[PDB]
Design a protein around this ligand. Structure first.
Ligand SMILES: Cc1cc(=O)c(O)c(C(=O)O)o1
Ligand SMILES: [Mn+2]
Ligand SMILES: [Mn+2]
Length: 178
């Protein structure tokens, strides 16, 4: 059911990218179905965030060679410090990397968990939930209200589609993919 939901509610490029990533790390999308749903969800949010500028450079969703090539290239041309972990986007307006979090827990909880993982990075963090809450470093939300609204609508819609199919309860009590 969850597997069907993913193939039927996300765009094939996203499903394919999610699927590939899982398979290369020897994870089965048919088994880790909540993880699959989470990967697709996070991928879509990153793409949606990208498609609101050429304000943003998309890092997530590429292979690691391409991802680090983009990062090194941004670092050389801007002077900005290299992160230890691949972030999700670069913002050429604010001239900072962004880490995007999508969580089924409280936003402040996930925010802390992410901020702790990459502390000593100057990376901007922007967390979204499936309840329309967000949290961003310095309450700087980067995007305008309409763009933010569109991401939250999409997240809430995924949530409610899951609930239509009695999948939301499994999904929410899982953290796999965060
Ligand atoms: C588990 C997790 C959560 C993310 O938000 C993220 O961007 C990544 C990633 O880029 O690997 O991994
Ligand atoms: Mn990422
Ligand atoms: Mn992320």
């Amino acid at each position: 059911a969850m597997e069907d939901f993913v193939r039927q509610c996300f765009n094939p490029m996203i499903v394919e990218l999610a699927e590939k990533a899982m398979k290369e790390y020897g994870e089965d999308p048919k088994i880790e179905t909540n993880k699959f749903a989470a990967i697709c969800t996070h991928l879509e949010v990153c793409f949606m965030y990208s498609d609101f500028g050429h304000r943003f450079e998309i890092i997530e969703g590429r292979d690691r060679i391409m991802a680090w090539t983009v990062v090194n290239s941004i670092c050389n041309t801007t002077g900005v410090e290299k992160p230890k972990f691949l972030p999700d986007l670069y913002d050429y307006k604010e001239n900072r990397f962004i880490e995007i979090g999508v969580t089924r827990r409280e936003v402040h909880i996930y925010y802390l968990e992410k901020a702790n993982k990459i502390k000593s990075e100057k990376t901007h963090i922007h967390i979204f939930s499936f309840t329309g809450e967000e949290m961003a470093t310095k309450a700087d939300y980067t995007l305008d209200e309409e763009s933010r609204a569109r991401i939250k609508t999409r997240l809430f819609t995924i949530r409610q589609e899951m609930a239509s199919r009695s999948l939301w309860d499994s999904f929410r009590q899982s953290e796999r993919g965060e």
